[PDB]
Amino acid sequence: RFSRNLKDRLESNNYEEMELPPPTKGVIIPVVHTVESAPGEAFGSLLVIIPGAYPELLDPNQQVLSHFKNDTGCVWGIGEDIPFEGDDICYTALPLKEIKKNGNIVVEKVFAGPAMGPSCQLGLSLLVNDIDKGVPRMVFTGEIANDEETIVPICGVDIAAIAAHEHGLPLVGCQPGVDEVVANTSLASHLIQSGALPVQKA
């Protein structure tokens, strides 16, 4: 599906870049973009999700709020409610141009609608359950099963991986096409704490 023609067109849809100091914590996830006017063509980009409610930082087409289950937090820029609980914090999903070695994040506004579908769930589950400090240098994509632990495959994995790789990052998910494969949220948590795939030397 990868079109470098569609990516370049909608690059002028990117406006107002800025560099921020490091958030207290965050997580990075991919979003897969298609236009109706260009059937067959897709391109990915990245969102970094940080603490605090900052709708003013979003393009107005992304200024929608989704809720975690039972009134336990929310996230701006995500288009569908999240079927598990959060940690009582509202977050904001910002388009991510670059995460730097010092922790700074360069973000931008983008003329586009919010992230739809369930692929943001794996990063969100990790953000509210497992990440306390810093932003893992990894891109997470996957739907979370009703048991709240098992990860389920999503659409557009190869588009997501290209978007991750363009930013110098590995893609993390449950399915073929990712760089590190995690069956469930414990494993993805253990990956975060390890810093990389654990290494076996014979």
- Residue ranges in contact with Mg ion by CB under 5 A: 117, 119, 154-155
Closer of 105 and 154 to Mg ion (Cβ): 154
Between 23 and 77, name the residue whose CB sits nearer to Mg ion: 77
Minimum Å gap between C-beta 154 and Mg ion is 4
Say if residues 174 and 181 touch (Cβ distance below 8 Å): yes
> What is d(CA 20, CA 99) in angstroms, rounded to the nearest whole number?
10
For Mg ion, the nearest residue by Cβ is 154
Pick between residue 29 and residue 58 the one whose CB is nearest to Mg ion. 29
Tokens 């087409």 correspond to what residue?
Answer: 61
CA distance 202 to 191: 21
Q: List CB contacts of 185: < 8 A, sequence separation 6 or more.
A: 122, 125, 126, 129, 130, 144, 148, 149, 151
Cβ nearer to Mg ion, comparing 35 with 53: 35
Smallest distance from the beta carbon of 80 to Mg ion, in angstroms? 11
Residue with token string 């969100």: 124
Q: How far is the CB of 111 from Mg ion (least distance, A)?
A: 22
Provide, rounded to whole angstroms, the least separation between the CB of residue 151 and Mg ion: 12
